[PDB]
Amino acid sequence: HHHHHHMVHITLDRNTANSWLIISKDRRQVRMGDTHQNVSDNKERFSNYPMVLGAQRFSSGKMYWEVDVTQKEAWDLGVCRDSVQRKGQFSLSPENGFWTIWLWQDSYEAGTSPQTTLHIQVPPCQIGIFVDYEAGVVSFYNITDHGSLIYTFSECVFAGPLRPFFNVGFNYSGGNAAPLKLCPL
Protein backbone atom coordinates (compact mmCIF):
# COMPACT_ATOMS: atom_id res chain seq x y z
CA HIS A 1 0.00 0.00 0.00
CA HIS A 2 0.97 3.74 -0.31
CA HIS A 3 -0.98 5.08 2.80
CA HIS A 4 2.19 5.69 4.94
CA HIS A 5 2.19 9.52 4.21
CA HIS A 6 -1.16 9.89 6.17
CA MET A 7 0.73 8.73 9.31
CA VAL A 8 -0.63 10.22 12.58
CA HIS A 9 1.05 10.14 16.06
CA ILE A 10 -1.39 8.23 18.29
CA THR A 11 -1.21 8.33 22.11
CA LEU A 12 -3.30 6.32 24.60
CA ASP A 13 -5.95 8.02 26.80
CA ARG A 14 -5.34 6.78 30.44
CA ASN A 15 -8.83 7.91 31.51
CA THR A 16 -10.51 5.39 29.14
CA ALA A 17 -8.34 2.42 30.18
CA ASN A 18 -9.64 -0.59 32.03
CA SER A 19 -8.34 -0.34 35.62
CA TRP A 20 -5.91 -3.33 35.19
CA LEU A 21 -4.03 -1.71 32.26
CA ILE A 22 -0.54 -0.20 32.54
CA ILE A 23 0.20 2.54 30.00
CA SER A 24 3.83 3.62 29.52
CA LYS A 25 5.09 7.14 30.37
CA ASP A 26 5.19 8.08 26.63
CA ARG A 27 1.51 6.84 26.28
CA ARG A 28 2.64 4.65 23.33
CA GLN A 29 2.52 1.18 24.99
CA VAL A 30 -0.10 -0.69 27.01
CA ARG A 31 -0.13 -4.09 28.76
CA MET A 32 -2.33 -6.14 31.11
CA GLY A 33 -1.22 -5.85 34.75
CA ASP A 34 -1.56 -8.82 37.15
CA THR A 35 -3.94 -6.72 39.44
CA HIS A 36 -6.02 -3.49 39.71
CA GLN A 37 -3.65 -0.54 38.98
CA ASN A 38 -4.90 1.67 41.88
CA VAL A 39 -6.87 4.23 39.81
CA SER A 40 -10.34 5.70 40.63
CA ASP A 41 -13.32 4.52 38.57
CA ASN A 42 -14.97 6.86 36.00
CA LYS A 43 -17.70 6.60 33.34
CA GLU A 44 -15.10 6.47 30.46
CA ARG A 45 -13.30 3.24 31.60
CA PHE A 46 -14.03 -0.02 29.79
CA SER A 47 -15.18 -2.22 32.76
CA ASN A 48 -15.44 -5.80 31.39
CA TYR A 49 -12.45 -6.11 28.97
CA PRO A 50 -8.78 -4.94 28.83
CA MET A 51 -9.60 -2.07 26.40
CA VAL A 52 -8.34 1.51 25.96
CA LEU A 53 -8.86 4.31 23.41
CA GLY A 54 -6.45 6.66 21.65
CA ALA A 55 -6.67 10.32 22.77
CA GLN A 56 -7.05 11.49 19.13
CA ARG A 57 -10.55 12.06 17.64
CA PHE A 58 -11.05 11.99 13.86
CA SER A 59 -14.11 13.45 12.04
CA SER A 60 -12.56 13.94 8.51
CA GLY A 61 -9.57 13.03 6.30
CA LYS A 62 -7.25 10.08 5.90
CA MET A 63 -5.28 8.67 8.88
CA TYR A 64 -2.74 5.81 9.19
CA TRP A 65 -0.95 4.23 12.17
CA GLU A 66 0.88 0.98 13.05
CA VAL A 67 0.71 -1.32 16.07
CA ASP A 68 3.22 -3.95 17.24
CA VAL A 69 1.55 -7.24 18.34
CA THR A 70 4.77 -9.35 18.73
CA GLN A 71 4.32 -12.59 20.76
CA LYS A 72 0.68 -11.94 21.72
CA GLU A 73 -1.88 -14.76 21.68
CA ALA A 74 -5.00 -12.51 21.71
CA TRP A 75 -5.85 -8.83 20.94
CA ASP A 76 -8.37 -6.62 19.15
CA LEU A 77 -7.38 -3.55 17.03
CA GLY A 78 -9.15 -0.93 14.96
CA VAL A 79 -11.33 2.18 15.48
CA CYS A 80 -14.57 2.91 17.20
CA ARG A 81 -17.12 5.67 17.70
CA ASP A 82 -16.43 8.07 20.56
CA SER A 83 -19.97 7.11 21.86
CA VAL A 84 -19.43 3.29 22.21
CA GLN A 85 -20.72 1.55 25.36
CA ARG A 86 -18.01 1.33 28.10
CA LYS A 87 -19.80 -0.77 30.81
CA GLY A 88 -21.01 -4.37 30.71
CA GLN A 89 -20.89 -7.01 27.98
CA PHE A 90 -21.03 -6.21 24.25
CA SER A 91 -19.82 -7.64 20.90
CA LEU A 92 -17.41 -5.85 18.57
CA SER A 93 -19.51 -5.04 15.48
CA PRO A 94 -20.19 -2.06 13.20
CA GLU A 95 -23.78 -2.01 14.60
CA ASN A 96 -22.20 -1.32 18.08
CA GLY A 97 -19.77 1.29 16.63
CA PHE A 98 -16.57 -0.82 16.16
CA TRP A 99 -14.45 -1.53 13.04
CA THR A 100 -11.92 -4.10 14.28
CA ILE A 101 -9.93 -7.29 13.60
CA TRP A 102 -8.61 -9.72 16.20
CA LEU A 103 -6.45 -12.72 16.99
CA TRP A 104 -8.02 -15.41 19.18
CA GLN A 105 -7.13 -19.15 19.57
CA ASP A 106 -4.71 -19.23 16.65
CA SER A 107 -7.19 -17.64 14.13
CA TYR A 108 -7.61 -14.08 12.79
CA GLU A 109 -11.15 -12.69 12.29
CA ALA A 110 -12.80 -9.39 11.33
CA GLY A 111 -15.36 -7.99 13.81
CA THR A 112 -18.42 -8.19 11.53
CA SER A 113 -21.70 -9.70 12.84
CA PRO A 114 -21.26 -12.59 12.57
CA GLN A 115 -17.42 -12.51 12.45
CA THR A 116 -15.52 -13.12 9.20
CA THR A 117 -12.56 -15.52 8.81
CA LEU A 118 -9.32 -13.81 7.69
CA HIS A 119 -6.72 -15.54 5.41
CA ILE A 120 -3.23 -14.64 6.71
CA GLN A 121 -0.27 -16.82 5.54
CA VAL A 122 2.43 -14.82 7.48
CA PRO A 123 1.39 -14.16 11.13
CA PRO A 124 1.80 -10.39 11.58
CA CYS A 125 4.15 -8.81 14.15
CA GLN A 126 2.96 -5.28 13.13
CA ILE A 127 -0.50 -4.20 11.81
CA GLY A 128 -1.18 -1.02 9.76
CA ILE A 129 -4.62 0.66 10.18
CA PHE A 130 -5.93 3.09 7.53
CA VAL A 131 -9.11 5.19 7.94
CA ASP A 132 -10.65 7.24 5.11
CA TYR A 133 -13.43 9.14 6.90
CA GLU A 134 -15.13 10.60 3.82
CA ALA A 135 -14.99 7.31 1.84
CA GLY A 136 -16.32 5.25 4.82
CA VAL A 137 -13.31 2.83 4.73
CA VAL A 138 -11.24 1.10 7.42
CA SER A 139 -8.41 -1.14 6.11
CA PHE A 140 -5.85 -3.37 7.84
CA TYR A 141 -2.39 -4.25 6.44
CA ASN A 142 0.20 -6.93 7.35
CA ILE A 143 3.47 -4.92 7.77
CA THR A 144 5.47 -8.21 8.33
CA ASP A 145 4.31 -9.40 4.83
CA HIS A 146 5.31 -6.31 2.74
CA GLY A 147 2.07 -4.43 3.64
CA SER A 148 -0.33 -7.04 2.19
CA LEU A 149 -4.09 -6.37 2.70
CA ILE A 150 -5.75 -8.19 5.61
CA TYR A 151 -9.29 -6.74 5.53
CA THR A 152 -11.34 -3.74 4.28
CA PHE A 153 -14.56 -2.53 5.89
CA SER A 154 -16.34 -0.43 3.25
CA GLU A 155 -19.70 1.40 3.30
CA CYS A 156 -18.90 2.24 6.95
CA VAL A 157 -21.50 4.36 8.79
CA PHE A 158 -19.17 6.01 11.37
CA ALA A 159 -22.04 8.27 12.68
CA GLY A 160 -19.70 10.28 14.91
CA PRO A 161 -16.08 11.09 15.72
CA LEU A 162 -13.72 8.04 15.62
CA ARG A 163 -11.09 7.00 18.18
CA PRO A 164 -8.24 4.49 17.82
CA PHE A 165 -9.31 1.29 19.65
CA PHE A 166 -7.15 -1.35 21.46
CA ASN A 167 -7.72 -4.56 23.43
CA VAL A 168 -4.56 -6.21 24.92
CA GLY A 169 -6.63 -9.35 25.73
CA PHE A 170 -6.80 -11.39 28.92
CA ASN A 171 -3.81 -13.38 30.15
CA TYR A 172 -5.48 -16.53 31.61
CA SER A 173 -2.83 -18.66 29.74
CA GLY A 174 0.31 -16.88 31.01
CA GLY A 175 1.30 -16.54 27.31
CA ASN A 176 -0.38 -13.17 26.52
CA ALA A 177 1.44 -10.68 28.84
CA ALA A 178 3.25 -8.82 26.03
CA PRO A 179 2.22 -5.20 25.29
CA LEU A 180 0.58 -3.51 22.32
CA LYS A 181 3.02 -0.81 21.11
CA LEU A 182 2.38 2.13 18.76
CA CYS A 183 5.27 2.01 16.23
CA PRO A 184 7.28 5.10 15.31
CA LEU A 185 6.64 6.97 12.01
Ligand X SMILES: Cc1c([C@@H](C)NS(C)(=O)=O)cnn1C
Q: Which residues form the interface with ligand X (CB under 6 A)? A: 18-20, 36, 47-50
Rg (CA), the chain: 15
From the CB of 24, what's the least distance to ligand X, in Å? 18
122, burial (CB in 10 Å: exposed 0-12, middle 13-18, buried 19+): exposed
Q: Which is nearer to ligand X, 142 or 171 (CB)?
A: 171
Residue type at 26? D
Q: Which is nearer to ligand X, 88 or 114 (CB)?
A: 88
**Residue 58 DSSP one-character state:** B
From the CB of 18, what's the least distance to ligand X, in Å? 5
Q: Which is nearer to ligand X, 60 or 172 (CB)?
A: 172
From the CB of 86, what's the least distance to ligand X, in Å? 10
Q: Which is nearer to ligand X, 77 or 150 (CB)?
A: 77
Q: Using an 8 Å Cβ cutoff, are 129 and 78 in contact?
A: yes
Q: Which is nearer to ligand X, 47 or 144 (CB)?
A: 47
- Sign, Cα dihedral of 21, 25, 30, 34: negative
Q: Which of 183, 127, 124, 133 is nearest to 156 (CA)?
A: 133
From the CB of 93, what's the least distance to ligand X, in Å? 20
From the CB of 39, what's the least distance to ligand X, in Å? 10
- The dihedrals phi and psi of 17, each to the nearest 5 degrees, come to -70, 140
